[PDB]
Structure 1
Amino acid sequence: MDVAGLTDCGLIRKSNQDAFYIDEKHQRFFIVADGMGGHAGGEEASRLAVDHIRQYLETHLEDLQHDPVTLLRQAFLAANHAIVEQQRQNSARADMGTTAVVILLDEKGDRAWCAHVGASRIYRWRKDQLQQITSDHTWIAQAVQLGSLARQHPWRHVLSQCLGREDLSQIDIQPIDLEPGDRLLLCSDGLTEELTDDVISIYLSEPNVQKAAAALVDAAKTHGGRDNVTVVVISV
């Protein structure tokens, strides 16, 4: 398997509050986080999420990989608590929060557990078709699930769930089986606010994952780059 990861402040934002991690040693897990909060809170929250999820997975993967749902829930909860602790004792950053999307590959490497909180996304690509795997935790997406139909709504990026909340009430986890040649994309909404799924799907057809990741980021910026943008591209 081949993997590439890139983050970029974009063309507008003063600082980058996205973060990511790739397990380059064993290629077992991959993490993207999109932080929010003034007074540099967003940067702290996304960094905490990535570091705490990584550390939890590194520490507990051997013991728990037979129960990936429990493992991933506990990793996210560790991140959540770490952010809340810093809130509780950091008045200026009391509202900091972050999304996270995580892929954990099983040992064989052909099943991906997809875990998330927020509106960063995981997609799977296969033979020029693209499928969004995660369901955005936004009020606007929830409505679309129910009886109202959003891509232009001014509040589309308003989150209904986020790490950094004592009242975190949902961690979505589901497995996806993989075939050779599939690709997986983890991305912050800095990508999807600029590029339609059709466009994303084309860049993911680029044989070289290094180039595909660079192309997605460059395209997001060419289209406006109004937000921080982060991608991790995995080729199965």
Structure 2
Amino acid sequence: MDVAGLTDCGLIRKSNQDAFYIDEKHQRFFIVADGMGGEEASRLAVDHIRQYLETHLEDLQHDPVTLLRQAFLAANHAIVEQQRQNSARADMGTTAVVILLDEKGDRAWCAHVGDSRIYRWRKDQLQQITSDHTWIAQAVQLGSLTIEQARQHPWRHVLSQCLGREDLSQIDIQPIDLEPGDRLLLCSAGLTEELTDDVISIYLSEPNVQKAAAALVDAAKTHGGRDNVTVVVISV
């Protein structure tokens, strides 16, 4: 498999509070986080999830749901501890999206908290796997609010879940089976606020994943680059 990752401050923001990690050694897991002390929070999330998976993958890869829940909870606690040991950054928080591949490499466990996304691409069609933890997306799902005005709503990106909360309740985890030639995309909402799914799907069709990742970021900036933007692209 091939993988590429890229983060960019974008054209407007003063600093980049997104972070990411790719397991380049063994290609087992991939992480993107979007902070909001947001830089501390996203860095804690990425580091703690990485270290937890590195440590427990061997023992727990047979129970990926428990492994992922425990990794996310470790990150959550680390952020909450720093909130307590820090009045200034008392409300710091971050999203996270994680893919953990099984040993064989043709199943991706997708885990997330927040409005960063995982997508799967296949033969020029793109599917969003994760459902945003936003008050707005919850409306579209269970009630009155179309994707039409939801994508236009001003509270579009207010989070209903984030890492860094004592009362973290929801960690969404689901498996997806993979076929050769599939692409997986982990991204912060800096990408999807600028690029429609149709546009994203085109850049993902670029055979070279390093080129696809760079093109996605460049495209997000050419479209306005209003926020930090991070992508990880995996070719199966």
Q: Distance in 2 between matches of 1:43 and 1:158?
A: 18
Q: Distance in 1 between matches of 2:207 and 2:201?
A: 12
SS at match of 1:130: strand
- Superposed displacement of residue 215, structure 1: 0.2
SS at match of 1:50: helix
Q: Which residue of 2 aligns with 1:10?
A: 10
Q: Distance in 2 between matches of 1:155 and 1:11?
A: 22
Q: Distance in 2 between matches of 1:147 and 1:66?
A: 37
Unaligned runs of 5+ in 1: none
Paired positions, count: 232
Q: Distance in 1 between matches of 2:214 and 2:168?
A: 34
Q: Distance in 1 between matches of 2:30 and 2:206?
A: 20
- Superposed displacement of residue 147, structure 1: 1.7
List per-residue Cα deviations over 1:14-64 (Å, max 9, x = no partner): 00000000000000000000000xxxx100000000000000000000000
SS at match of 1:24: coil
List per-residue Cα deviations over 1:137-186 (Å, max 9, x = no partner): 00000000012220000000000000000000100000000000000000
Q: Distance in 1 between matches of 2:205 and 2:222?
A: 19
List per-residue Cα deviations over 1:51-94 (Å, max 9, x = no partner): 00000000000000000000000000000000000001100000
Compute the TM-score of the two structures, normalised by the length of structure 2.
Answer: 0.98
Q: Distance in 2 between matches of 1:153 and 1:46?
A: 26
Q: Distance in 1 between matches of 2:190 and 2:197?
A: 13
Q: Distance in 2 between matches of 1:144 and 1:11?
A: 30
SS at match of 2:110: strand
Q: Distance in 1 between matches of 2:113 and 2:133?
A: 7
List per-residue Cα deviations over 1:200-221 (Å, max 9, x = no partner): 0000000000000000000000
Compute the TM-score of the two structures, normalised by the length of structure 1.
Answer: 0.98
Identical columns (%): 99
Q: Distance in 1 between matches of 2:131 and 2:208?
A: 28
Q: 5 Å matches for 1:74-223?
A: 74-149=70-145, 150-223=150-223
- Superposed displacement of residue 7, structure 1: 0.1
Q: Distance in 2 between matches of 1:47 and 1:19?
A: 6
Q: Distance in 1 between matches of 2:120 and 2:71?
A: 23
SS at match of 2:88: helix
CA RMSD of aligned residues (A): 0.3
Q: Which residue of 2 aligns with 1:225?
A: 225
- Superposed displacement of residue 107, structure 1: 0.1
Q: Distance in 2 between matches of 1:114 and 1:185?
A: 11
Unaligned runs of 5+ in 2: none
